[PDB]
Ligand binder design. Sequence first.
Ligand SMILES: *[C@@H]1O[C@H](CO)[C@@H](O[C@@H]2O[C@H](CO)[C@@H](O[C@@H]3O[C@H](CO[C@H]4O[C@H](CO)[C@@H](O)[C@H](O)[C@@H]4O)[C@@H](O)[C@H](O[C@H]4O[C@H](CO)[C@@H](O)[C@H](O)[C@@H]4O[C@H]4O[C@H](CO)[C@@H](O)[C@H](O)[C@@H]4O)[C@@H]3O)[C@H](O)[C@H]2NC(C)=O)[C@H](O)[C@H]1NC(C)=O
Ligand SMILES: *[C@@H]1O[C@H](CO)[C@@H](O[C@@H]2O[C@H](CO)[C@@H](O[C@@H]3O[C@H](CO[C@H]4O[C@H](CO)[C@@H](O)[C@H](O)[C@@H]4O)[C@@H](O)[C@H](O[C@H]4O[C@H](CO)[C@@H](O)[C@H](O)[C@@H]4O)[C@@H]3O)[C@H](O)[C@H]2NC(C)=O)[C@H](O)[C@H]1NC(C)=O
Ligand SMILES: *[C@@H]1O[C@H](CO)[C@@H](O[C@@H]2O[C@H](CO)[C@@H](O[C@@H]3O[C@H](CO)[C@@H](O)[C@H](O[C@H]4O[C@H](CO)[C@@H](O)[C@H](O)[C@@H]4O)[C@@H]3O)[C@H](O)[C@H]2NC(C)=O)[C@H](O)[C@H]1NC(C)=O
Ligand SMILES: *[C@@H]1O[C@H](CO)[C@@H](O[C@@H]2O[C@H](CO)[C@@H](O[C@@H]3O[C@H](CO)[C@@H](O)[C@H](O)[C@@H]3O)[C@H](O)[C@H]2NC(C)=O)[C@H](O)[C@H]1NC(C)=O
Ligand SMILES: *[C@@H]1O[C@H](CO)[C@@H](O[C@@H]2O[C@H](CO)[C@@H](O)[C@H](O)[C@H]2NC(C)=O)[C@H](O)[C@H]1NC(C)=O
Ligand SMILES: *[C@@H]1O[C@H](CO)[C@@H](O[C@@H]2O[C@H](CO)[C@@H](O)[C@H](O)[C@H]2NC(C)=O)[C@H](O)[C@H]1NC(C)=O
Ligand SMILES: *[C@@H]1O[C@H](CO)[C@@H](O[C@@H]2O[C@H](CO)[C@@H](O)[C@H](O)[C@H]2NC(C)=O)[C@H](O)[C@H]1NC(C)=O
Ligand SMILES: *[C@@H]1O[C@H](CO)[C@@H](O[C@@H]2O[C@H](CO)[C@@H](O)[C@H](O)[C@H]2NC(C)=O)[C@H](O)[C@H]1NC(C)=O
Ligand SMILES: *[C@@H]1O[C@H](CO)[C@@H](O[C@@H]2O[C@H](CO)[C@@H](O)[C@H](O)[C@H]2NC(C)=O)[C@H](O)[C@H]1NC(C)=O
Ligand SMILES: *[C@@H]1O[C@H](CO)[C@@H](O[C@@H]2O[C@H](CO)[C@@H](O)[C@H](O)[C@H]2NC(C)=O)[C@H](O)[C@H]1NC(C)=O
Ligand SMILES: *[C@@H]1O[C@H](CO)[C@@H](O[C@@H]2O[C@H](CO)[C@@H](O)[C@H](O)[C@H]2NC(C)=O)[C@H](O)[C@H]1NC(C)=O
Ligand SMILES: *[C@@H]1O[C@H](CO)[C@@H](O)[C@H](O)[C@H]1NC(C)=O
Ligand SMILES: *[C@@H]1O[C@H](CO)[C@@H](O)[C@H](O)[C@H]1NC(C)=O
Ligand SMILES: *[C@@H]1O[C@H](CO)[C@@H](O)[C@H](O)[C@H]1NC(C)=O
Ligand SMILES: *[C@@H]1O[C@H](CO)[C@@H](O)[C@H](O)[C@H]1NC(C)=O
Ligand SMILES: *[C@@H]1O[C@H](CO)[C@@H](O)[C@H](O)[C@H]1NC(C)=O
Ligand SMILES: *[C@@H]1O[C@H](CO)[C@@H](O)[C@H](O)[C@H]1NC(C)=O
Ligand SMILES: *[C@@H]1O[C@H](CO)[C@@H](O)[C@H](O)[C@H]1NC(C)=O
Ligand SMILES: *[C@@H]1O[C@H](CO)[C@@H](O)[C@H](O)[C@H]1NC(C)=O
Ligand SMILES: *[C@@H]1O[C@H](CO)[C@@H](O)[C@H](O)[C@H]1NC(C)=O
Ligand SMILES: *[C@@H]1O[C@H](CO)[C@@H](O)[C@H](O)[C@H]1NC(C)=O
Lengths: 126, 126, 126, 453, 48
Amino acid sequence: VFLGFLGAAGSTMGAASMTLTVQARNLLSGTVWGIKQLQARVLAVERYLRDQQLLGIWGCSGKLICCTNVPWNSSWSNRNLSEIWDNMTWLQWDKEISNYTQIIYGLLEESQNQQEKNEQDLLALD
Amino acid sequence: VFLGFLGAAGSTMGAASMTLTVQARNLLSGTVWGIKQLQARVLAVERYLRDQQLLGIWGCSGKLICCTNVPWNSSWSNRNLSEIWDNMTWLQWDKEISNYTQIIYGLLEESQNQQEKNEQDLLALD
Amino acid sequence: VFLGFLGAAGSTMGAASMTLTVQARNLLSGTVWGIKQLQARVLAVERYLRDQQLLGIWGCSGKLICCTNVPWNSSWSNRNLSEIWDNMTWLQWDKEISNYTQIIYGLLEESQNQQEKNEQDLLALD
Amino acid sequence: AENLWVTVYYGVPVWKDAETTLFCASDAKAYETEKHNVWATHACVPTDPNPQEIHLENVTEEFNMWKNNMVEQMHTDIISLWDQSLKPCVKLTPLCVTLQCTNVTNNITDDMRGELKNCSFNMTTELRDKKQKVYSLFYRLDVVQINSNKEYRLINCNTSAITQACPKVSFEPIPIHYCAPAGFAILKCKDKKFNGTGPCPSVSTVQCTHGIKPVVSTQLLLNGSLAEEEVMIRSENITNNAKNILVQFNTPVQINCTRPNNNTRKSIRIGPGQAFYATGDIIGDIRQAHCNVSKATWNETLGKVVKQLRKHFGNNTIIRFANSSGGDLEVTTHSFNCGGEFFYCNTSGLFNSTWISNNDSITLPCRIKQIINMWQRIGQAMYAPPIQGVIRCVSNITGLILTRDGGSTNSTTETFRPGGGDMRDNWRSELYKYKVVKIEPLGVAPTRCKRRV
Amino acid sequence: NPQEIHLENVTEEFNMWKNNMVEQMHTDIISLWDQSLKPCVKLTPLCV
Ligand SMILES: *[C@@H]1O[C@H](CO)[C@@H](O[C@@H]2O[C@H](CO)[C@@H](O[C@@H]3O[C@H](CO[C@H]4O[C@H](CO)[C@@H](O)[C@H](O)[C@@H]4O)[C@@H](O)[C@H](O[C@H]4O[C@H](CO)[C@@H](O)[C@H](O)[C@@H]4O[C@H]4O[C@H](CO)[C@@H](O)[C@H](O)[C@@H]4O)[C@@H]3O)[C@H](O)[C@H]2NC(C)=O)[C@H](O)[C@H]1NC(C)=O
Ligand SMILES: *[C@@H]1O[C@H](CO)[C@@H](O[C@@H]2O[C@H](CO)[C@@H](O[C@@H]3O[C@H](CO[C@H]4O[C@H](CO)[C@@H](O)[C@H](O)[C@@H]4O)[C@@H](O)[C@H](O[C@H]4O[C@H](CO)[C@@H](O)[C@H](O)[C@@H]4O)[C@@H]3O)[C@H](O)[C@H]2NC(C)=O)[C@H](O)[C@H]1NC(C)=O
Ligand SMILES: *[C@@H]1O[C@H](CO)[C@@H](O[C@@H]2O[C@H](CO)[C@@H](O[C@@H]3O[C@H](CO)[C@@H](O)[C@H](O[C@H]4O[C@H](CO)[C@@H](O)[C@H](O)[C@@H]4O)[C@@H]3O)[C@H](O)[C@H]2NC(C)=O)[C@H](O)[C@H]1NC(C)=O
Ligand SMILES: *[C@@H]1O[C@H](CO)[C@@H](O[C@@H]2O[C@H](CO)[C@@H](O[C@@H]3O[C@H](CO)[C@@H](O)[C@H](O)[C@@H]3O)[C@H](O)[C@H]2NC(C)=O)[C@H](O)[C@H]1NC(C)=O
Ligand SMILES: *[C@@H]1O[C@H](CO)[C@@H](O[C@@H]2O[C@H](CO)[C@@H](O)[C@H](O)[C@H]2NC(C)=O)[C@H](O)[C@H]1NC(C)=O
Ligand SMILES: *[C@@H]1O[C@H](CO)[C@@H](O[C@@H]2O[C@H](CO)[C@@H](O)[C@H](O)[C@H]2NC(C)=O)[C@H](O)[C@H]1NC(C)=O
Ligand SMILES: *[C@@H]1O[C@H](CO)[C@@H](O[C@@H]2O[C@H](CO)[C@@H](O)[C@H](O)[C@H]2NC(C)=O)[C@H](O)[C@H]1NC(C)=O
Ligand SMILES: *[C@@H]1O[C@H](CO)[C@@H](O[C@@H]2O[C@H](CO)[C@@H](O)[C@H](O)[C@H]2NC(C)=O)[C@H](O)[C@H]1NC(C)=O
Ligand SMILES: *[C@@H]1O[C@H](CO)[C@@H](O[C@@H]2O[C@H](CO)[C@@H](O)[C@H](O)[C@H]2NC(C)=O)[C@H](O)[C@H]1NC(C)=O
Ligand SMILES: *[C@@H]1O[C@H](CO)[C@@H](O[C@@H]2O[C@H](CO)[C@@H](O)[C@H](O)[C@H]2NC(C)=O)[C@H](O)[C@H]1NC(C)=O
Ligand SMILES: *[C@@H]1O[C@H](CO)[C@@H](O[C@@H]2O[C@H](CO)[C@@H](O)[C@H](O)[C@H]2NC(C)=O)[C@H](O)[C@H]1NC(C)=O
Ligand SMILES: *[C@@H]1O[C@H](CO)[C@@H](O)[C@H](O)[C@H]1NC(C)=O
Ligand SMILES: *[C@@H]1O[C@H](CO)[C@@H](O)[C@H](O)[C@H]1NC(C)=O
Ligand SMILES: *[C@@H]1O[C@H](CO)[C@@H](O)[C@H](O)[C@H]1NC(C)=O
Ligand SMILES: *[C@@H]1O[C@H](CO)[C@@H](O)[C@H](O)[C@H]1NC(C)=O
Ligand SMILES: *[C@@H]1O[C@H](CO)[C@@H](O)[C@H](O)[C@H]1NC(C)=O
Ligand SMILES: *[C@@H]1O[C@H](CO)[C@@H](O)[C@H](O)[C@H]1NC(C)=O
Ligand SMILES: *[C@@H]1O[C@H](CO)[C@@H](O)[C@H](O)[C@H]1NC(C)=O
Ligand SMILES: *[C@@H]1O[C@H](CO)[C@@H](O)[C@H](O)[C@H]1NC(C)=O
Ligand SMILES: *[C@@H]1O[C@H](CO)[C@@H](O)[C@H](O)[C@H]1NC(C)=O
Ligand SMILES: *[C@@H]1O[C@H](CO)[C@@H](O)[C@H](O)[C@H]1NC(C)=O
């Protein structure tokens, strides 16, 4: 089944995780009034590389999905595994964790691949 | 030997596969009439990221070469291994598979890394 | 400790290697006179993808740090391990190897991932 | 295990309301109309032959037609469109000469009040020496006397400069699709009953909106999108009598407008290069422009609206319709464009009714002005060139712009009058089902998954 | 130091009469002519 772009928006996070390769595909899409679209499509790739840079500096690079070595703090809306992926939408979820989104981002780019990759340089010399 | 940009264009696919890192290098390259090049070099990076996005959503990301778990359908010009890499150029080859290029692309972005990476999330939790 | 953008510029290379994820973060950052910033921020992403392309065609892709199979030629300022990372800054170091920077780059993009990845295609078929 | 770990997801259906730079789209047949770039379609992106509309199941998104930025963007686009089209056009700077005008050739009565003026004046030729004694034909609304015979002047000479619209371009409204750039999307409300504000049960996403023709008009909404089922009534604040009431029709009201005057285009030469298009003598009878509305259709449509008005102003109340209070000509009359001319019709025959709790055509007196100043703009006056032959146009009355009085006596009766002025309202009648959102595909979520060492 | 790579074994069909570089160059020289005459002196009162 292919609901299309933003298809599983009202679906659970677990269900919408199957439609990840759909919203990612149509995310980049390939005299005045003509400069209207130029300045817009320039911001389009800047918006793309911005997320890609974050996706790269973290322990991901490879898009879609990736795991990280960061313990989930209970203060970030303590829900259960079956209460998140099977009883909540991504829109509804992003509304709660929005307060801690900037906090989590810092624990991914700094605490991980700066300490993890440097750790690997010590493990690869032997 | 270094034939240069588009050097092994008339060479076999097997031979031209040695010149992959050459066409990839010169692919990005680093008042009116000055806006002529601006709108052009903007399309240059959009054309680059477009292929890079496809190269990323597939089971590749790492450029140049990568393998995939997709069986070659005989309907896509049934040729042999020694009849493709040692008796056909990339220009001549792209002319035949052009009909099925859009079809193959769908089997790489959707059928693979959406089902493969999700499969890994089940294998990495244990 | 977080000295900030370009923080460990006067620090040793070994010490400044801890601040790699800091200079990388603020490297992309998200009628006339308004076109002044447009043409500038276009060059900003072209400058980014240029380094990212080199970082990709080499045996890296994954940013920050990565190793390579290239022997360090003594002609490139013969210093010792403890005399580089603990007695020299990145600014001071780049000044000496500047003569051989273009030379080293060629040994990374051509000699490696063009011969290494092709080698892997032979190792992955069996 | 039992302790969760964060996992980065890329490509999650997560969006938030925002504002961005929208670009255009207008088919491929519209570009074949050519005629030296009519209106806007010059470097506009061709519309996708097979557009896609994804119905977002289970999704309820709140819309706001009164706080939608697509309108403020479209409005600034049409205005800038107007200026770019008049830049390479002929400037009528030396047309402010003293005009020795007289009545048009006809036979009385004294109630005909002239209307048409036969103005004779001096004019600069190609050479910078000898002048030119040529005559033209201006409307009374275009001229104004100043104090021997009657001497006049152009009505804009004491207000601003004047430039003549090029005869190559046309003011024919063509469908324009508004699209959002990559990373953005446009949501579309698909319920049959929606007052433009509140949560929407059936929401779908699109890349480009439907073909929205930029028809500039007042009082009567022309060539718009018809409503579903019952006619719709939308207002930012119904309790506030200062807020306009946008009406949308279900069944279109057939309207016919004509210009019963075979005009002649005199092309006097104000060289070198520039050329002014005057109005020659009139071939035939001296008749005035008019608009017809089928009495049968208008009676049912108005009666269908008042039944919806009682749903907001009490079930058993009296609704009375009255004409405009007064002011500018663009506000008191039905201003619109047909065949290049700018009509100004008397709407005292459409809003002359009184509704209690329970076969021909309506002709409307229409005036014509050549020198206009739309969008409340000062500094740029456009002289619309005369059009040869009788002009006929058939349009759709698809909505009204009504205003309510403050005289109250509120719990008794209510009076509604036609309004307009702000052209931003005209776009809201088509952009009520669209809003701009940005996609943020980066979402973090916990799961019992950990990486390697 | 311009580079010219000779594509060995390659046979490509050209068409000087259906080449778009001409239509692009032509529109360039024309636009070039207009931009160079915009800040120039207009001889409007020379038609005496
Ligand atoms: C709401 O929507 C309706 C429906 O779309 C719309 O009605 C349209 O009215 C306009 C008038 O304002 C019509 O436009 C003109 O139509 C006449 C008559 O067309 C006949 O011929 C065609 C074949 O070509 C038949 O298919 C058709 O049925 C008619 O029999 C045309 O003659 C007009 O052409 C002139 O104007 C064009 C644009 O302005 C120019 O491109 C064209 O070259 C013509 O300009 C010149 O023509 C002569 C040279 O040949 C020259 O001598 C003249 O001086 C002039 O400079 C024009 O197309 C339109 O057709 C109607 N729509 C439909 C579907 O028929 C309402 O106007 C609209 N309401 C509002 C408020 O916008
Ligand atoms: C707005 O106002 C303008 C005035 O500025 C009017 O323009 C004038 O219109 C009148 C028509 O009533 C014109 O008068 C006519 O001029 C003709 C020109 O004569 C030509 O032919 C002779 C040879 O016969 C040549 O020698 C000469 O050089 C010309 O080439 C006359 O032929 C006409 O005569 C006819 O009418 C009279 C009426 O009494 C008859 O007795 C005659 O037998 C004959 O049938 C006539 O005199 C005048 O020339 C126009 N002037 C200008 C400057 O254009 C507009 O008509 C008016 N428009 C409106 C809508 O009111
Ligand atoms: C040119 O214009 C003049 C205008 O001055 C016009 O002459 C006028 O004609 C009207 C009638 O057409 C006259 O009005 C009449 O007034 C008397 C009262 O004194 C009435 O009794 C008349 O009624 C009769 O005529 C009506 C005409 O429609 C009939 O409908 C009615 O049933 C009666 O039979 C009429 O109202 C007016 O007095 C004159 N004015 C002058 C100054 O003479 C002339 O006809 C016009 N010519 C052309 C060719 O257009
Ligand atoms: C003025 O309003 C009338 C409505 O009475 C408009 O006529 C209608 O035009 C629409 C298209 O805009 C027609 O819809 C079409 O229906 C066919 C039926 O299969 C469908 O295949 C098409 O895809 C399209 O949806 C509609 O049929 C037609 N009404 C009638 C009775 O024929 C008219 O176009 C309006 N004029 C304007 C806006 O200028
Ligand atoms: C057009 O210009 C001429 C000038 O050539 C005007 O003719 C003069 O009019 C003035 C009064 O307006 C008289 O005093 C002169 O005797 C006239 N003749 C000349 C100056 O040679 C004519 O009136 C103008 N027509 C207009 C303004 O409609
Ligand atoms: C330009 O001229 C017009 C027309 O004469 C002026 O409009 C008049 O404004 C006064 C305001 O006191 C009204 O009483 C008149 O009825 C208006 N005239 C018409 C024909 O509508 C306008 O004020 C002038 N602008 C100036 C002098 O700046
Ligand atoms: C407005 O004009 C249209 C056409 O210009 C009229 O529709 C015509 O109606 C008559 C009946 O009286 C039919 O014989 C014609 O075939 C119709 N024409 C078309 C093209 O369908 C319409 O009746 C007019 N309405 C008003 C109020 O004047
Ligand atoms: C609205 O309609 C009324 C008629 O009901 C108009 O009132 C007339 O105005 C004229 C002025 O031109 C007077 O000579 C009449 O005596 C008035 N009639 C009545 C019954 O009062 C009014 O002018 C119209 N207003 C608009 C803006 O159209
Ligand atoms: C619009 O129409 C109305 C009514 O048809 C006009 O009002 C008339 O005004 C004149 C004076 O100008 C009076 O002699 C009439 O008695 C009025 N008619 C009625 C029915 O009262 C009005 O003048 C027209 N024009 C405008 C601009 O409103
Ligand atoms: C609105 O329509 C009514 C008719 O329903 C008009 O009433 C006219 O009133 C005058 C005197 O007040 C009579 O001489 C007319 O005979 C009436 N008309 C009819 C058709 O009988 C009223 O004038 C209209 N209002 C406007 C502003 O036009
Ligand atoms: C308006 O008048 C013009 C002429 O002033 C008419 O044009 C004529 O049209 C007929 C056929 O329609 C041709 O045979 C003539 O040669 C035309 N004359 C000129 C001078 O071009 C035009 O037809 C009139 N308009 C209408 C609706 O009849
Ligand atoms: C979790 O959040 C709380 C705030 O409620 C904070 O005090 C605590 O330090 C956080 N945990 C970690 C490991 O930072
Ligand atoms: C996020 O923080 C704001 C104030 O900072 C608070 O009002 C809101 O309730 C918080 N979100 C949740 C889901 O509690
Ligand atoms: C291979 O192509 C044929 C068309 O000739 C098609 O019927 C078949 O389904 C394709 N194979 C697969 C696995 O889809
Ligand atoms: C590709 O398809 C077209 C028609 O769709 C056909 O004419 C052509 O021969 C096909 N290509 C090959 C190599 O057969
Ligand atoms: C190292 O540099 C010297 C130049 O001093 C050069 O001759 C030599 O070939 C280089 N080594 C390699 C392996 O290329
Ligand atoms: C680099 O080369 C230049 C001349 O090519 C030379 O002057 C300079 O000393 C060299 N750098 C070092 C560190 O020796
Ligand atoms: C024009 O006609 C009107 C009609 O009311 C009249 O008052 C005026 O005197 C006439 N003027 C001329 C110059 O004929
Ligand atoms: C609408 O108007 C009323 C009174 O005119 C006012 O009290 C109210 O705040 C306004 N806004 C609403 C109801 O949203
Ligand atoms: C038709 O209009 C007249 C007035 O013009 C009105 O009295 C009558 O009620 C209307 N009929 C209907 C069915 O609305
Ligand atoms: C008005 O009364 C009608 C019945 O005549 C009813 O259908 C409608 O719902 C009522 N509107 C209200 C109460 O707002």
